[PDB]
């Protein structure tokens, strides 16, 4: 006994019966191999196209992290006026669109409008050899 800080553990539940609540991670190497092949098959399905898509630059939520920026669900319609594109066109060029997102600042529109402009400048669009030698983006676009 003596000066032991009190245990905060929870007594084991359904140990030998009912729900299987022990889920050992013995497949961690295996899962990583499975995900890699699936990602590689997706990349092959559109060789010129990137596996992932351009995501908006958003300020991290809450005061503790509200001075750095993280990738988010999509660009708002006001941020799409900056690149002059409709929502459907944005999907065609790989821009994900969050129509729900509201910029909440005029400054927010500008960092996003710049990000949208770069994708449109960097992208090359093809509707034979060029597609074969295109080289797709590997990684999150412009992290």
């Amino acid at each position: 006994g003596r000066n032991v800080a009190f245990s905060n553990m929870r007594r084991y539940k359904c140990t030998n019966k009912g729900p299987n609540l022990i889920k050992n991670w013995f497949n961690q190497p295996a899962r990583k191999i499975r995900r890699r092949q699936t990602r590689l098959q997706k990349a092959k399905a559109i060789f010129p196209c990137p596996l992932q898509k351009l995501r908006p630059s958003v300020t991290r939520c809450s005061q503790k992290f509200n001075l750095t920026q993280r990738i988010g669900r999509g660009f708002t319609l006001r941020e799409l006026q900056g690149v002059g594109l409709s929502a459907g066109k944005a999907r065609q060029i790989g821009i994900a669109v969050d129509p729900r997102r509201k910029n909440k600042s005029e400054e927010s529109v500008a960092r996003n409008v710049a990000r949208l402009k770069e994708y449109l400048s960097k992208v090359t669009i093809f509707s034979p050899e060029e597609i074969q030698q295109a080289i797709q983006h590997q990684g999150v676009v412009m992290p």
């Binding site: 084991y12 729900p19 609540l21 050992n24 961690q28």
Partner: protein
């Protein structure tokens, strides 16, 4: 709905409306769909009923009444512990991961 679904297992249950009520008994009018009629299978809007995942919507509480009892209709704080399912959310929270690299 569950009583109608048992009486006709061949038919699929959509939603149910309310028709009348008396102090002794309430009368709810269910709307059911025949999943095999060529019209239904050859109609884009309702084709989702003939998917076999949607068999017995009412036995598995996947209707609106089910979504009210499970509380799925409430969203946000207060349903956080019932979204994947009432049972699954408890299961995910109460699991010893025992991650390998640990």
């Amino acid at each position: 709905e569950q009583k109608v679904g048992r009486r006709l297992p061949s038919l699929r249950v959509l939603n149910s409306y309310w028709v009348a009520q008396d102090g002794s008994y309430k009368w709810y009018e269910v709307i059911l769909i025949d999943p095999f009629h060529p019209w239904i299978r050859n109609d884009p809007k309702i084709n989702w009923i003939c998917n076999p995942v949607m068999k017995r919507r009412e036995c598995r509480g996947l209707t609106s009444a089910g979504r009210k009892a499970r509380g799925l209709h409430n969203k946000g704080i207060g349903a956080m512990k019932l979204r994947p399912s009432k049972r699954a959310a408890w299961k995910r929270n109460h699991t010893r991961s025992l991650r390998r690299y640990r």
